[PDB]
PDB file of C-alpha atoms in Angstrom:
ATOM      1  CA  UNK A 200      54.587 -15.894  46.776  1.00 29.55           C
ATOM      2  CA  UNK A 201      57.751 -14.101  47.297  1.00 30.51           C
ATOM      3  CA  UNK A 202      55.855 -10.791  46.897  1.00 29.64           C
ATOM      4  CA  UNK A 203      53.538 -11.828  49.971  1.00 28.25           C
ATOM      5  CA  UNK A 204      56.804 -12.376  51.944  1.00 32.70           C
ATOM      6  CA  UNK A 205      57.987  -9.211  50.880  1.00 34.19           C
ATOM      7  CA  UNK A 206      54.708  -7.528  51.926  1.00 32.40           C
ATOM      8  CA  UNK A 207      54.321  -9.004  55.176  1.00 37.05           C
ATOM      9  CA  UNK A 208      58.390  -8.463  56.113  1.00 34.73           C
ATOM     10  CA  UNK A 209      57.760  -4.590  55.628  1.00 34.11           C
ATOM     11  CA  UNK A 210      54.233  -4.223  57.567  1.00 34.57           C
ATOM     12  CA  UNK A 211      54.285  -7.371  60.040  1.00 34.14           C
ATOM     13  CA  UNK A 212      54.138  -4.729  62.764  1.00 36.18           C
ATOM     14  CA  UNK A 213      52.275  -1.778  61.619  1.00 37.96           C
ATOM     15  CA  UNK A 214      48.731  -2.264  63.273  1.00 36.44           C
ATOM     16  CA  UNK A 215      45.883  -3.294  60.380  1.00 34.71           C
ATOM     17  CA  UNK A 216      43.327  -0.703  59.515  1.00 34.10           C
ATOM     18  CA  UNK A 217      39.341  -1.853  59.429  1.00 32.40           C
ATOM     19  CA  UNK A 218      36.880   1.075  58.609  1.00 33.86           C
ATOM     20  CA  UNK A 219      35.878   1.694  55.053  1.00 31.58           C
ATOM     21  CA  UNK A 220      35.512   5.711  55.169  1.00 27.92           C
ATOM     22  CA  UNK A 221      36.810   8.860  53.739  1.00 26.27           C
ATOM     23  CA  UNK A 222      36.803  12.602  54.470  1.00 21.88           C
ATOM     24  CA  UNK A 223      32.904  12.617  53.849  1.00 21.95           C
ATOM     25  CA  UNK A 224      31.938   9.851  56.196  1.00 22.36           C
ATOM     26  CA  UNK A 225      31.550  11.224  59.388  1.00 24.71           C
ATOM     27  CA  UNK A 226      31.625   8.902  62.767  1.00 24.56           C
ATOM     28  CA  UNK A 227      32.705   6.882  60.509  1.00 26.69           C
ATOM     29  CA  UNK A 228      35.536   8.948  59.036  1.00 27.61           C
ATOM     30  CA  UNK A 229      36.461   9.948  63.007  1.00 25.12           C
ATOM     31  CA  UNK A 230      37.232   6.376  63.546  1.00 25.38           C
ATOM     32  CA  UNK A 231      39.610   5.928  60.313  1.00 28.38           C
ATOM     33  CA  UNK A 232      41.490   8.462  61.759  1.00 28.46           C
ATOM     34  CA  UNK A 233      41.599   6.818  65.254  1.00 29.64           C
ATOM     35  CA  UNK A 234      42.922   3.899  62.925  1.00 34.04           C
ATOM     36  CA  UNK A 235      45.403   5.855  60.964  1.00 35.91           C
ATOM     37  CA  UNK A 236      46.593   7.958  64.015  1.00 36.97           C
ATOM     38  CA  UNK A 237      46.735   4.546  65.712  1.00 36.13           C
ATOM     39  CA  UNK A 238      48.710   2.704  62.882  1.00 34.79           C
ATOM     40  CA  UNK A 239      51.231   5.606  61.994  1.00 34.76           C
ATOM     41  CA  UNK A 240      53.000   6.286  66.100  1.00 32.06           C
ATOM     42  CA  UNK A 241      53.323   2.196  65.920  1.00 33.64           C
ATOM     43  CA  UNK A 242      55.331   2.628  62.944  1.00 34.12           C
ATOM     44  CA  UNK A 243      57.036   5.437  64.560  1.00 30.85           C
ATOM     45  CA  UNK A 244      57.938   4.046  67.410  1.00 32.16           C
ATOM     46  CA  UNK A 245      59.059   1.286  66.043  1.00 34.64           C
ATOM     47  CA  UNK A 246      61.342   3.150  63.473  1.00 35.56           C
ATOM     48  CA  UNK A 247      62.571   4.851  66.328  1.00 38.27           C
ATOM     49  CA  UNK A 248      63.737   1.369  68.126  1.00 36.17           C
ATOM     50  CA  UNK A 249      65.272   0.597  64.512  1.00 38.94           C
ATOM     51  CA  UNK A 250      67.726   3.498  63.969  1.00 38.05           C
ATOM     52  CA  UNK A 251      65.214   4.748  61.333  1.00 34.41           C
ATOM     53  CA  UNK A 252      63.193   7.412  62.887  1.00 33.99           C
ATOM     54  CA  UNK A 253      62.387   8.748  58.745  1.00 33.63           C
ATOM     55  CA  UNK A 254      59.915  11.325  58.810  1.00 36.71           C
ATOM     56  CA  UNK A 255      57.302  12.991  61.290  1.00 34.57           C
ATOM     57  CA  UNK A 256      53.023  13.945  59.734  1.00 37.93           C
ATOM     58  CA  UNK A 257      50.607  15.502  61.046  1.00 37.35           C
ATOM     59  CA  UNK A 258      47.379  16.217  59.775  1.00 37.40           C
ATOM     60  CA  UNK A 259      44.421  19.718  59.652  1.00 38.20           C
ATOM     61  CA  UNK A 260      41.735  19.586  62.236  1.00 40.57           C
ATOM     62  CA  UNK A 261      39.371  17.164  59.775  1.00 41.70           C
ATOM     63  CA  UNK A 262      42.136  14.500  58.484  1.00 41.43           C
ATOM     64  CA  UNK A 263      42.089  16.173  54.793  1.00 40.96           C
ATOM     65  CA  UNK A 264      45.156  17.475  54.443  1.00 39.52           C
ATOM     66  CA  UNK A 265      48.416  16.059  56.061  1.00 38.42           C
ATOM     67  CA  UNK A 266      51.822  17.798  55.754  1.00 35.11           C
ATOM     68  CA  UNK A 267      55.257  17.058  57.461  1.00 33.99           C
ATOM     69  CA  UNK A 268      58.715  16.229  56.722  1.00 32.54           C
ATOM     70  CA  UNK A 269      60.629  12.984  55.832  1.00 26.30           C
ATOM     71  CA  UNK A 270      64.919  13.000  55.868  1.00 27.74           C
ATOM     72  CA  UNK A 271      67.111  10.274  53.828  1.00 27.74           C
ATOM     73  CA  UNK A 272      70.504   9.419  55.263  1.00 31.40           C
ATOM     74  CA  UNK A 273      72.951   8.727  52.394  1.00 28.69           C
ATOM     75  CA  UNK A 274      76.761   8.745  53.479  1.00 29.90           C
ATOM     76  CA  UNK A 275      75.708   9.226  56.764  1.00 30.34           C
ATOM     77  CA  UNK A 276      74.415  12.800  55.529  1.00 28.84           C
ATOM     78  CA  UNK A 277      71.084  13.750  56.140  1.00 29.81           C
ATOM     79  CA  UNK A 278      68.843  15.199  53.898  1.00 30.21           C
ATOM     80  CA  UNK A 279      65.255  16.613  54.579  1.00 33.22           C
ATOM     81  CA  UNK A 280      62.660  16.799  52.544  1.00 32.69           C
ATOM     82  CA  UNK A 281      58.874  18.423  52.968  1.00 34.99           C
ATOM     83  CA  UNK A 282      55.891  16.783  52.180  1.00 31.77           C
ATOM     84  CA  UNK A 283      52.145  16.896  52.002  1.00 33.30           C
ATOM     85  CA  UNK A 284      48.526  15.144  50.014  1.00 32.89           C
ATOM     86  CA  UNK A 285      45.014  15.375  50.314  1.00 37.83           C
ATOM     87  CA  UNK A 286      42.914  12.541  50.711  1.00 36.96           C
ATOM     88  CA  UNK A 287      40.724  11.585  48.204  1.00 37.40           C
ATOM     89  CA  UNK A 288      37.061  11.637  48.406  1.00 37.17           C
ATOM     90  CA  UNK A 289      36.853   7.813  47.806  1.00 37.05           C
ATOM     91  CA  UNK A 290      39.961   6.972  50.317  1.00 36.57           C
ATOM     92  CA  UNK A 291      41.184   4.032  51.630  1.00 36.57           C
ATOM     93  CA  UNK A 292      40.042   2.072  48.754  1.00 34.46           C
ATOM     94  CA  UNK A 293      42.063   5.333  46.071  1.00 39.71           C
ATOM     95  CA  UNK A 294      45.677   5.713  48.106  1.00 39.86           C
ATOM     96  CA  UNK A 295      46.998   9.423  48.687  1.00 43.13           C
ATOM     97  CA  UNK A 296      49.017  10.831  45.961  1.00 42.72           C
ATOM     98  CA  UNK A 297      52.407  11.776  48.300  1.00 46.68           C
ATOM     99  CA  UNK A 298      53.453  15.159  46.884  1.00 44.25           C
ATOM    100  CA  UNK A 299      57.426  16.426  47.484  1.00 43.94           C
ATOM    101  CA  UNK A 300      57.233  19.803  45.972  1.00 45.60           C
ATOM    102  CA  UNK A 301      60.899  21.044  46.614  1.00 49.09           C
ATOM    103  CA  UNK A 302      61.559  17.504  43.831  1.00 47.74           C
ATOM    104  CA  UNK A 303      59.061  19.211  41.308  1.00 44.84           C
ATOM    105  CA  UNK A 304      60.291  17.914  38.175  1.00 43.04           C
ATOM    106  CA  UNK A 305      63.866  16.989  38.884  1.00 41.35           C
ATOM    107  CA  UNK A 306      63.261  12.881  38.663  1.00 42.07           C
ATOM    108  CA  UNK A 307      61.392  11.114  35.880  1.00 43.18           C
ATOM    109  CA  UNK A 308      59.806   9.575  38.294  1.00 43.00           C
ATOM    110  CA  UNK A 309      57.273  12.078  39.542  1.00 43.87           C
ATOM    111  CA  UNK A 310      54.253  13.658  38.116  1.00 42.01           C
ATOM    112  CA  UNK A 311      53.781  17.928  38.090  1.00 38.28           C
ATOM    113  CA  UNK A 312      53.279  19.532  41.479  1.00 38.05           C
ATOM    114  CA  UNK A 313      56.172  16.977  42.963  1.00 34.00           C
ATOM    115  CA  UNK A 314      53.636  13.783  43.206  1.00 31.32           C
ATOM    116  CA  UNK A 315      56.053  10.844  43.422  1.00 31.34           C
ATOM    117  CA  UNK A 316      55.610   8.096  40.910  1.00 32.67           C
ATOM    118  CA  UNK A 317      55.014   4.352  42.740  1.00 34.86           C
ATOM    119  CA  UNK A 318      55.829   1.360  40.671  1.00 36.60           C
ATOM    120  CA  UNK A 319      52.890  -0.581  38.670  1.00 37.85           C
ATOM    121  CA  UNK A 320      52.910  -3.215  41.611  1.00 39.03           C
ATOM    122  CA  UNK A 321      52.510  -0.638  44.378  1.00 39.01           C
ATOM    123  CA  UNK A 322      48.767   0.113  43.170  1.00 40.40           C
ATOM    124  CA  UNK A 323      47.153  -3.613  42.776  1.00 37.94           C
ATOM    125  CA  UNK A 324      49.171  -4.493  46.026  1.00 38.42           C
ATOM    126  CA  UNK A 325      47.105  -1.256  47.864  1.00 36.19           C
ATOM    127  CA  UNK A 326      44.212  -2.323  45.681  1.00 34.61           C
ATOM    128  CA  UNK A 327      44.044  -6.202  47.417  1.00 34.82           C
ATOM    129  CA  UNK A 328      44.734  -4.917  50.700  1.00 34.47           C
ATOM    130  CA  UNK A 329      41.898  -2.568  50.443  1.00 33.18           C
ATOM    131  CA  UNK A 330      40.769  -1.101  53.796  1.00 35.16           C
ATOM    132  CA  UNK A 331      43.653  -2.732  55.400  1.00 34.53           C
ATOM    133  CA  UNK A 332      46.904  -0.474  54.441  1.00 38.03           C
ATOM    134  CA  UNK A 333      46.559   3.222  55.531  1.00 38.30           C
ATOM    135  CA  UNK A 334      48.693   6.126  55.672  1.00 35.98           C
ATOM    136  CA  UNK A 335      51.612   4.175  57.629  1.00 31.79           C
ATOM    137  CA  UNK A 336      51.856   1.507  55.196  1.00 31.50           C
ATOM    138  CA  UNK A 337      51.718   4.091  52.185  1.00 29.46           C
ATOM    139  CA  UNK A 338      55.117   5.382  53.882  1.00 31.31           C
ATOM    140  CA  UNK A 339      56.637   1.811  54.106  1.00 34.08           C
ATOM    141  CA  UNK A 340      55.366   0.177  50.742  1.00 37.56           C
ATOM    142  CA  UNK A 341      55.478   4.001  49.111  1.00 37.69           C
ATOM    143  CA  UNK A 342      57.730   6.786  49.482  1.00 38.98           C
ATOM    144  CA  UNK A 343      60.280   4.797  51.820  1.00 36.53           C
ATOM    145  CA  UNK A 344      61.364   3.091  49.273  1.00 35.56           C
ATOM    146  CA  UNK A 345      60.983   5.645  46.783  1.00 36.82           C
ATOM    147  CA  UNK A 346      63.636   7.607  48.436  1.00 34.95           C
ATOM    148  CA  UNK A 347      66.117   4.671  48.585  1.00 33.91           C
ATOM    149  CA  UNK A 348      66.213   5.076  44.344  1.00 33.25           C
ATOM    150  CA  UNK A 349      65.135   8.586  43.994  1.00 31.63           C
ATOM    151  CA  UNK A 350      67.825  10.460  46.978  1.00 30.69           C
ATOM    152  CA  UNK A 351      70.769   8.383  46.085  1.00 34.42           C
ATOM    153  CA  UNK A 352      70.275   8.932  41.974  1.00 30.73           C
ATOM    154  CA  UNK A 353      69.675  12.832  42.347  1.00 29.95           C
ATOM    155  CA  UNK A 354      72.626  13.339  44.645  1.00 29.93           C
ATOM    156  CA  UNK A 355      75.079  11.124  42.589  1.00 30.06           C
ATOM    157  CA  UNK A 356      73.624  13.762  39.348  1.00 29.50           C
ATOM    158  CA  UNK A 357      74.537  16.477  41.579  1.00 30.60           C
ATOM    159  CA  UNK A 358      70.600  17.884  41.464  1.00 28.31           C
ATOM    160  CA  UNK A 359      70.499  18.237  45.059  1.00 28.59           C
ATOM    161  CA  UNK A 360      73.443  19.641  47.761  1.00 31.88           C
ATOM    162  CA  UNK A 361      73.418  18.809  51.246  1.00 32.24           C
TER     163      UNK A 361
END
C-alpha cells in the first residue's frame, strides 16, 4: 500500500508509543507522558540532524495543555507561528485538535479559534494506529504538512508579511 510506505517513510524513526491513557488516568497517564516526552526530543533531534529543526512544545505541570511555537521556511524566509491544544479526555485513541490562533480564519482550511483542518485520511490513519502515534507523529503526519500548503498559499495571497 503506497499509503503504508508513505506512513512508515515519515515516522520510521520517531519512537512508538504503548500506554492507552489520558489526562484522567493517573500512573498510567504519568507514563504516556514519559512516552510522549520520550517520542517528541527523538523527533527533535533528529529534525535537528536534518536541517529541519520546525518547532519547539512544551507542556503545564499535568500534560493538559501544551503550547509552543513552530516556524516555516519559504524563500529561505522564516516565518513563526504560535501554537497550543488541550488533550482530550479520551486521548490517544481522539488526536489533539492543533490550534494556530494568530491563522484564525484566514485559510479555509481551519475551524474557529485557529484549529487547523487535517485531511479525511489523517483521522482513520490516527484511528488504525491507535495508541501507537502521539504528539510527535501528530506534528509529522499533521501540522507539518499542513504548513507546506497552508504558509506558501497565504503568503503568495499576501495574508501574511514576513
Amino acid at each position: 500500500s503506497m499509503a503504508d510506505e508513505a506512513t512508515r517513510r515519515v515516522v520510521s524513526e520517531i519512537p512508538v508509543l504503548k500506554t492507552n491513557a489520558g489526562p484522567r488516568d493517573r500512573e498510567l497517564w504519568v507514563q504516556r507522558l514519559k512516552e510522549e516526552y520520550q517520542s517528541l526530543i527523538r523527533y527533535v533531534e533528529n529534525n535537528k540532524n536534518a536541517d529541519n529543526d520546525w518547532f519547539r512544545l512544551e507542556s503545564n505541570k499535568e500534560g493538559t495543555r501544551w503550547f509552543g511555537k513552530c516556524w516555516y521556511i519559504h524563500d529561505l524566509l522564516k516565518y513563526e507561528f504560535d501554537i497550543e491544544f488541550d488533550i482530550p479526555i479520551t486521548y490517544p485513541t481522539t488526536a489533539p485538535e492543533i490550534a494556530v490562533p494568530e491563522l484564525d480564519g484566514k485559510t479555509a482550511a481551519m475551524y474557529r479559534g485557529g484549529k487547523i483542518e487535517l485531511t479525511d485520511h489523517f483521522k482513520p490513519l490516527w484511528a488504525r494506529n491507535v495508541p501507537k502515534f502521539g504528539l510527535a507523529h501528530l506534528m509529522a503526519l499533521g501540522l507539518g504538512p499542513w504548513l507546506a500548503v497552508e504558509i506558501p498559499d497565504l503568503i503568495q495571497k499576501g495574508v501574511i508579511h514576513h
